[model samples]
Target: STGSATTTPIDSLDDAYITPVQIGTPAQTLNLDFDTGSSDLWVFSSETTASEVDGQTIYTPSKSTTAKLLSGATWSISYGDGSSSSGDVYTDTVSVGGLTVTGQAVESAKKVSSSFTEDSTIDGLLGLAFSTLNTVSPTQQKTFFDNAKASLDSPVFTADLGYHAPGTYNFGFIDTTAYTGSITYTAVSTKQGFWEWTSTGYAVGSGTFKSTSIDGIADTGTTLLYLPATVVSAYWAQVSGAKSSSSVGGYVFPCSATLPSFTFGVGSARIVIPGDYIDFGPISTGSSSCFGGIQSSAGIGINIFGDVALKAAFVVFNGATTPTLGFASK
Candidate 1:
């Protein structure tokens, strides 16, 4: 049987979401952020630094007889906010939907950053990226998808992201009813351990397509779309009161402005993103200046196709020896 898991938006803007996963015997269920951009299945645990642990549901290995400590193994991931988390590793039975993987490396955080403790929603993170990006030191481990791929009916999974609604992640097979027309497949470069591909081109509103290629990574963990400075500059030029403010650190426009839709190409196919999706939200509670969901990736050094773009299309992640990505309108 194919595996399927449901996820809900964590905030009003549908920034990033979490999926419920069962870990250990007796099933200690935790709402884990399934991040396709990372490759470590770490969790807030009983061994976490006391002061750093907040209200998160910690995974106590002592409660599970099936858990086995992976002696000498440790993992660490740093964030741009100068926050980080490092921990000991343990292998346990981790289950999603009806699919179960035994001896899955479940990293237990021994020390976590203040930012993590502040975010009460996410108790842990389950990575879906290539195992090559795994942070485990001394001995790296395979991701849940990599471990389960061999037994799957097909070594593939699909991501269906919804706007302010519950979406699903289906493994082993694609759901035909979830999308429309034919799926356009493209080669993905795993050299950077990401779902990286080249987008054919883009168009603003009903404008003619600009015949250019943009190389970027498809990251489910990221909250917004980041393109080159020229592309972002061209987009805001169409809006009447849009300006790049150093105070807010990005482009902002009047909330009442008539925003235009954005269209990007995949091979010969096109995926249209509605104007409403680009309106992220107000700068503050009652501010008239609204932030944009698409921004420039100047300092970031790489373009990123995040949730803002992913929510508009049905995506397929094929985990073959030479991986490929499939995109379709839904």
Candidate 2:
């Protein structure tokens, strides 16, 4: 009735986290990114042309006795970073955190963008979004979480993310020791194929907390916090010599610039993001200038609370009842 998975940072690629899942018969393990922003369980596989795959481990449907290709079925997806993948579908047993789902639709990639192709370590994406948002054509696909939820103890999952280290994602049960203090809850709007929630307010440093409501997604697949242009501007203003650079992309600050902490509200709780987390390392090799983790979601319209922001708090994706989101300081 309960299952939990251990998550670790992609080594040499500190941007995101990865979790392993066993797919097909005889179990070929694939290290995938659990993306709540998307809703398709797609993977690199034998069907994918070799030229399109970099060094990722591909799922061999033919090798698995349980694999069944869904004739005339296919899937395609475009990510926020403009990365995309498209492929045909297969039904097989998919296991995550020791929880198994038989006849789960697995999209095997036939074509992948350079961003995904170059990431040799990531075998695929296990989307955790609502099944309705799945990209499968002719027939939609249900994600691993949705398929396994009926057997879950409480129909819930918790994300405990740590900086430069591994974190655990608990399913069907909440781990009280994951964070300190009471968990603050907020209603989530799921019309956008995301864990869309609004922050009651936001503030820069210890300054006056502006009651500015912000709409964004708590996305594990993304790396930084994409906020409104005005909010991003106000935060960087506190850092000396920080300016938006065209060549460097986003706002860049001097390596030694003093940084201020950022905070956001979730109902009555106030989660503060450390200044160090806001300083997202250097922009390029041997460069003394660095890019701020908090950037403008100008073009995208929707803001994203990616790994940078999630690591600062313990998040609960409550699928039961009204589909609310809960946040607690770690």
Score each candidate by Cα lDDT. 0.90, 0.89
Which digits, one per residue and each the tens of the lDDT, describe model 1 over residues 1-330?
Answer: 468999888888987888899999989998888888889999999999889887898999999988999999999997433667899999999998888899999999998889889888888889999999999989999999999899788999888999889899988999999999989998899999999999999998888899799999888888888999999998888899999998998999999998898998899999998888899889999999999988999998789989889989999999988899999999
Task: Report each candidate's C-alpha RMSD, comma-separated, in the order given.
Answer: 1.2, 1.2
| Candidate 2 per-residue lDDT over residues 86-188, each given as its tens digit | 9999999998887888999999999999998888889999998788889999998898888888888888888887787899888789899889998998989
Worst 10 residues of 2 by lDDT: 9-18
TM-score for candidate 2, residues paired by index: 0.97
Residue 170 alpha-carbon offset, candidate 2, angstroms: 1.7
C-alpha positional error of residue 62 in candidate 1 after TM-score superposition, expressed in Å: 1.0
Supply candidate 2's per-residue lDDT for 56: 92
